[PDB]
C-alpha cells in the first residue's frame, strides 16, 4: 500500500511537494490530467538516492525519498494550469527488472491513491445554488454555479432521495470558476405532495445550502 | 521514442461478449515489454498483464494478453460488469518507458431516446445580474447526441457548455447537459429559448422552448 498525501490547489510560478508514504522498490511519479492519458514524470530508487526525469520536467522537478520513514517525495516547480493533474506514485517491479545506466523501468505496481493537484489563478469561492423548477415524469434540479475549487457534494432529501439522480461532473469557465447541475426525475403527480430538497457543500468555503426546489 | 497507438479509442459491447484491445507501437518492443493497466473513475491504474502476455497476481484468468514486435493486444473472454472500464497500454522495454492513450471497453444496451426538459433562470439568478438556462437530455444510449440553442429561432454559438454523466450504473444510460448563459441584460432583449436535440432514437428533432 501506498499512502498519498492530500489535494493541493496552487497559483501558477508556486511549486508543490506531494508524498508516497510505503506501508525496495524504484518509486515511479506518473500524472494524468483531466480526461487524459498518463504521463511519466520521473523516479527514484529510494535507497541510493539515483535520480532519473524525463526530458519535458528536467530543470523544475526533484524527486527524493527518506529510507528511514520509507515515504518519497515529488517537487514540480514554475507550475501552470496545464500541470493540474492527478499525480500517482507507483513502485516499479524488481523481477525482470529493465535497467538502461542508472535508469530502471518494468511494470508498475501497487499504486498510490493519487493526489488531485489543481493550478488556477482563482481564489476560494463558495457556489451560488439556484433552483431549476419542474415545469408522466417531472424533472427538477439545483444549478450549482462559479465555485473554487473543487469538489462539491451534492445529495436531495438529506440523502433520502437516490433513485433517479444525476449529479454532472463540473465544467470549468473561463473565468476560472467551476459549475455544475444535480437533476432528478420523479413522477408528476408527486410535484404538489412531495418536498425536494438539494443539500449543496463545498467545504473550501464552509458552503452549506439546502434549496427546495418546487414548481 | 516509441509511440503507442491504442485501438478502438470506444469498444462498446455486451455482457457476456469476447473484447479484443490493440496496441501498436511505432517502433518494435523490445522483447515483450509490455504492460496493460485497466482504470476506473476515480480510482489508480491497476496492473493485469506484463511481458506481454504474464497475468499478474490476482488477476481473473479472462484477462490474457499477447502479441511481440509493433503488434500487441488485449482480450477479455467474455466481458463481466466490472471488466467496463478504461485500458492502457506501456511499453518499458526502451527509454523512456511510453503509454498508449486508452481504448474505453462500453457498455452496449439497447438503443434509448433522451427526455428532453428546460429550465429557465431563476428569480435568485436574475437578481445577481446573470442567466443561465439549462437543457437536459436524460437517460440515453448511444452517446452521440447533438444540442443546439435558438434565441428567437436565431442559432446561438459560442456561449454554452456541455456535461456529461458516466454510463449509470443501474441501466447503463447516459444523461447531458448543456448550459446557456447570457448577461441578464441579453437574456430580456428575447422572448423564445428552445433547446433542440438530435439523437438516433428520435424520429426527428426534439425541441423544448419556453417564453420568457
Known amino acids: 500500500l501506498l499512502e498519498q498525501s492530500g489535494p493541493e490547489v496552487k497559483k501558477p510560478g508556486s511549486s508543490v511537494k506531494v508524498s508516497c508514504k510505503d506501508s525496495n522498490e524504484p518509486v515511479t511519479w506518473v500524472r494524468q490530467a483531466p480526461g487524459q492519458g498518463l504521463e511519466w514524470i520521473g523516479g527514484?530508487?529510494?535507497?541510493?538516492?539515483?535520480?532519473k526525469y524525463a526530458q519535458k520536467f528536467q530543470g523544475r522537478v526533484i524527486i527524493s525519498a527518506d529510507a528511514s520513514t520509507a515515504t518519497a517525495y515529488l517537487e514540480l516547480s514554475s507550475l501552470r494550469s496545464e500541470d493540474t493533474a492527478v499525480y500517482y506514485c507507483?513502485?516499479?517491479?524488481?523481477?525482470?527488472?529493465?535497467?538502461?545506466?542508472?535508469?530502471?523501468?518494468?511494470?508498475?505496481?501497487?499504486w498510490g491513491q493519487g493526489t488531485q493537484v489543481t493550478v488556477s489563478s482563482a481564489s476560494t469561492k463558495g457556489p451560488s445554488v439556484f433552483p431549476l423548477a419542474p415545469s408522466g415524469t417531472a424533472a427538477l434540479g439545483c444549478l450549482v454555479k462559479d465555485y473554487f475549487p473543487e469538489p462539491v457534494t451534492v445529495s436531495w432529501n438529506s440523502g433520502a432521495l437516490t433513485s433517479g439522480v444525476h449529479t454532472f461532473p463540473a465544467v470549468l469557465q473561463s473565468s476560472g470558476l467551476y459549475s455544475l447541475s444535480s437533476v432528478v426525475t420523479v413522477p408528476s403527480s408527486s410535484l404538489g405532495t412531495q418536498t425536494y430538497i438539494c443539500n449543496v457543500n463545498h467545504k473550501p468555503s464552509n458552503t452549506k445550502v439546502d434549496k427546495k426546489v418546487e414548481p | 521514442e516509441i509511440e503507442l497507438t491504442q485501438s478502438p479509442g470506444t469498444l462498446s459491447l455486451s455482457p457476456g461478449e469476447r473484447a479484443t484491445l490493440s496496441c501498436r507501437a511505432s517502433q518494435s518492443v523490445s522483447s515483450s515489454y509490455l504492460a496493460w493497466y485497466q482504470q476506473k473513475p476515480g480510482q489508480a491504474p491497476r496492473l493485469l498483464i506484463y511481458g506481454a502476455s504474464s497475468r499478474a497476481t490476482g488477476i481473473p484468468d479472462r484477462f490474457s494478453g499477447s502479441g511481440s514486435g509493433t503488434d500487441f493486444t488485449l482480450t477479455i473472454s467474455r466481458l463481466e460488469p466490472e471488466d467496463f472500464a478504461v485500458y492502457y497500454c506501456?511499453?518499458?522495454?526502451?527509454?523512456?518507458?511510453?503509454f498508449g492513450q486508452g481504448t474505453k471497453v462500453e457498455i452496449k444496451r439497447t438503443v434509448a431516446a433522451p427526455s428532453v426538459f428546460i429550465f429557465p433562470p431563476s428569480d435568485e439568478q436574475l437578481k445577481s445580474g446573470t442567466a443561465s438556462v439549462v437543457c437536459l437530455l436524460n437517460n440515453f444510449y448511444p452517446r452521440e447526441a447533438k444540442v443546439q440553442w435558438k434565441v428567437d429561432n436565431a442559432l446561438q454559438s459560442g456561449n454554452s457548455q456541455e456535461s456529461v454523466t458516466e454510463q449509470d450504473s443501474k441501466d447503463s444510460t447516459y444523461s447531458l447537459s448543456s448550459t446557456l448563459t447570457l448577461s441578464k441584460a441579453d437574456y430580456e432583449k428575447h422572448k423564445v429559448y428552445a433547446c433542440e436535440v438530435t439523437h438516433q432514437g428520435l424520429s426527428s428533432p426534439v425541441t423544448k422552448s419556453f417564453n420568457r
Open positions: 507507483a513502485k516499479v517491479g524488481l523481477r525482470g527488472i529493465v535497467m538502461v545506466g542508472g535508469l530502471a523501468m518494468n511494470w508498475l505496481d501497487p
Open positions: 527514484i530508487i529510494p535507497a541510493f538516492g539515483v535520480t
Open positions: 506501456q511499453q518499458y522495454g526502451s527509454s523512456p518507458q511510453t
